Each structure stands twice: as structure tokens, then as C-alpha cells.
Design a binder for this molecule. Structure first.
Ligand SMILES: Nc1nc2c(ncn2[C@@H]2O[C@H](COP(=O)(O)OP(=O)(O)O)[C@@H](O)[C@H]2O)c(=O)[nH]1
Ligand SMILES: [Mg+2]
Lengths: 201, 191
């Protein structure tokens, strides 16, 4: 167990996204996107771990078509992301992203966000884009009751996280307070913007 | 002064926050928002004595697994909550929550708390469960897990109707006091 870097799970070159991510998202969107609490409700832990163990052996994405509780997939996705050796936004850009979201001027904040994203290795930008597009849909389904702020409170610890492997108790509590605002900005970027990274080639 | 630290843990959306608010304010929260971390308080009068009950709310999402342990230190009792109408949340009690607190607080008591019992008669709810060929958790099933996992007691309630709400906390108060060994022997400690 343990997982490696994000890039260690990409096979296709365009866009550079892990199959595991692609499949979870497709399934979640497949089931309609109308279940209350998507990503807020935990799937069955035993199930999430068993699906994960199959996968991590040689990176064989299992069929999710028959997993009935859709939350177990939401959980399986976040679990995959949250356990990479380095967060989706990478260690190197952790602060950058945080301070670009704290810029009180909306525009300049939006501008520094574009700059930071463009800094990420391609795999993370593509994978991140895919996710922002996915979540913007989730946030747009009334039934989910999961608005941008909710998603931001649940995904912030996952794709933003920390600037180091093991933060100390204080610095940790600090990052957590800052993560949400970062996810908010990312979600506020136009779909057009995110979509350009989705073209094959 | 004698303060009682109670930390509530459990899957997201089971109703941790709702029971803390309904109890302390007699008002049921309408909003649908995830809890990062919070802590309320109340002075209770049991045995004719003034007791301060420090309540600690936490995030059930696995995403907060590293930040949650920060509220454990000095805990006198844990309320491990699951929704009686969410079989998976009941499942994660033995597969995750009990393992977690006993790994951080080996000496701290904890009560199994079944929440949202009023939903056992919700037309929509029951049908969504059967749709997946599932059913709600019965008091008897929970009481068994309670014993198996060495919980002090099993209690359930509806934060909506407050049915069994006050009682949950009463038992949670007794669990931290009633024992013969000093209150200290049950208080959690870091590392
Ligand atoms: N019907 C019903 N719904 C409840 C009850 N308690 C909580 N809920 C709902 O369950 C969802 C999550 O509640 P919340 O207290 O935030 O759970 P938490 O994520 O553990 O803090 C919300 O829709 C609450 O209104 C209850 O006793 N009865
Ligand atoms: Mg809450």
C-alpha cells in the first residue's frame, strides 16, 4: 500500500489522467448525480479498502459498474487522491496556491490562480481540470445539496493538503483553515478554461 | 472545577452536529453543511452537583483523519455515532471508529450511539434501503455490537424529535463519573 505520485498512475498521454480517476468519475456521473451528500457521505470502509487493494496490486482498475453504494466510489476516489505521495497541487506549489486564493482582489486572485495551475506538472493540471469540471457538475445538481463551499470543505484537505509530508500540530491546523478558499477559486474558474486541457492532443 | 470532555465521532451526515445543537438549544438545524471542528458547552446538575459538559464536534470525512485526533487529548468519554438507517455507518463503527479511539485513547469510555431513529418510519428512506435490499439497524443488533466491542452502553435517539436525546448525554455523563477508579485514569493522553 502507500501509493506513489500522481503521474505513476497515468497511462494515456492525452489528457494525462489516471484510469482510476476517469472510471470513478464516469461511474459517479453515470448513476445520475442526484444522491444527497456526494463526497460528504462515507462509503463502507471495508468495501473501499478491498477495491483499493485490488487496484494497488498492479494498477488494475476494477469494474465499478456493479458497486451499488455510489458513496463507496466517491470515497474510493478521494482515498486515491489523498494517499498519493504528494497532493494533487504538489508540495512545491502548496503555499503559492494558498496565497493566490487569499488575494482579497477577486481578479488578481483569479489571475494568480491561472499562473499557479499553469505551473503544475501536466498530469496534475489535466487530472485537476477533469475534477473541477466533474465537481462543478456536482455543485450544479440541486439534489446533491453539495455546493461549492461544501465540496471545498471536503476536498480541501485532499487535493490541497500540506507543503510537507508531516506538518506539525499547529502548522497542520493552519493549512486546513486555508485549503478551502483554494478549492473555491479553482471551482470558480470557467468551464471553458478547464475544458481546454481536456482536448486529446 | 469538574469539567467533562465528550468527543463525538462518526461517519459524515449521521447527525453529530444536529444532536449537539438540538440538545443544547432545543432547535433542530436546517442547514446542510459539513463540520470541520467545533465545541459547545453546558453546565449540568447531576447528583445536585455542578458539572461542565464540554462537547466536541468533529468531521466524519476520512479527509480529516489526520486533524480529528487533535481533539482527543483530555477526553473523558467518546460518543461513537452511526445512523440507524445507514448500514454502512454502522459498519464503520467496528471497521474504523472504534479502532481509531482505542488506538488514541485506550483507557477512554465510549457509548454506541444510534442516531436518526425517527427515520425508521420514513416512507422514502425505507424504500431507498430496500431498493438496495437493505434494512435499518435494530436496537438488538446494535446492543450486540455494543457488547462485542466493549462499549459502555448502546443508546439511540432522533435529534429531530429529541426522542432519547437527553438520555444519551445522561449516560455519557455517568460513564465518565460513575466508575470507581479516579476520573484521571480515563482521560485521554497524546502519544
Ligand atoms: N430526519 C432526521 N434527519 C437528521 C437527524 N439528525 C440529523 N439529520 C440530518 O442528517 C444530515 C446531516 O446532519 P449533521 O448533523 O450535519 O450530521 P454530521 O455530518 O455528523 O454533523 C442533515 O440532513 C441533518 O439534518 C434526525 O435526527 N432525523
Ligand atoms: Mg457536523
Amino acid at each position: 500500500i502507500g501509493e506513489g505520485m500522481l503521474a505513476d498512475f497515468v497511462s494515456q498521454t492525452s489528457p494525462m489522467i489516471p484510469s482510476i480517476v476517469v472510471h470513478c468519475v464516469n461511474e459517479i456521473e453515470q448513476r445520475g448525480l442526484t444522491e444527497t451528500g456526494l463526497y460528504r457521505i462515507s462509503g463502507c470502509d471495508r468495501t473501499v479498502k478491498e477495491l483499493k487493494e485490488k487496484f494497488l496490486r498492479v494498477k488494475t482498475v476494477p469494474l465499478l459498474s456493479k458497486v451499488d453504494d455510489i458513496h463507496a466510489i466517491c470515497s474510493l476516489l478521494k482515498d486515491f487522491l489523498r494517499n498519493l505521495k504528494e497532493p494533487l497541487l504538489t508540495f512545491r506549489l502548496n503555499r503559492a496556491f494558498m496565497e493566490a486564493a487569499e488575494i482579497t482582489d477577486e481578479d488578481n486572485s483569479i489571475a494568480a490562480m491561472y499562473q499557479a495551475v499553469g505551473e503544475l506538472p501536466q498530469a496534475n493540471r489535466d487530472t485537476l481540470a477533469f475534477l473541477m469540471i466533474h465537481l462543478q457538475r456536482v455543485a450544479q445538481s440541486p439534489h446533491t445539496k453539495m455546493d461549492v463551499a461544501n465540496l471545498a470543505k471536503v476536498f480541501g484537505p485532499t487535493i490541497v493538503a500540506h507543503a510537507v509530508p508531516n506538518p506539525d500540530p499547529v502548522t497542520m491546523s493552519q493549512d486546513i483553515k486555508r485549503q478551502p478558499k483554494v478549492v473555491e477559486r479553482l471551482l470558480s474558474l470557467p468551464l471553458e478554461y478547464w475544458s481546454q486541457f481536456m482536448m486529446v492532443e | 472545577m469538574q469539567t467533562i470532555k465528550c468527543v463525538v465521532v462518526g461517519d459524515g451526515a449521521v447527525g453529530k452536529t444536529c444532536l449537539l445543537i438540538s440538545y443544547t438549544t432545543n432547535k433542530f438545524p436546517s442547514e446542510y453543511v459539513p463540520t470541520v471542528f467545533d465545541n459547545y458547552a453546558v453546565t449540568v446538575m447531576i447528583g445536585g452537583e455542578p458539572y461542565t459538559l464540554g462537547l466536541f464536534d468533529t468531521a466524519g470525512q476520512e479527509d480529516y483523519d489526520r486533524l480529528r485526533p487533535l481533539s482527543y487529548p483530555q477526553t473523558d468519554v467518546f460518543l461513537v455515532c452511526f445512523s440507524v438507517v445507514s448500514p454502512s455507518s454502522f459498519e464503520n463503527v467496528k471497521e474504523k471508529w472504534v479502532p481509531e479511539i482505542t488506538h488514541h485513547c485506550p483507557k477512554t469510555p465510549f457509548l454506541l450511539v444510534g442516531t436518526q431513529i425517527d427515520l425508521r418510519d420514513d416512507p422514502s428512506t425505507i424504500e431507498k434501503l430496500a431498493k438496495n435490499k437493505q434494512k435499518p439497524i435494530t436496537p438488538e443488533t446494535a446492543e450486540k455490537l455494543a457488547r462485542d466491542l466493549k462499549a459502555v452502553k448502546y443508546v439511540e435517539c432522533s435529534a429531530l424529535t429529541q426522542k432519547g436525546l437527553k438520555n444519551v448525554f445522561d449516560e455519557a455523563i455517568l460513564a465518565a463519573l460513575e466508575p470507581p477508579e479516579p476520573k484521571k485514569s480515563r482521560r485521554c493522553v497524546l502519544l
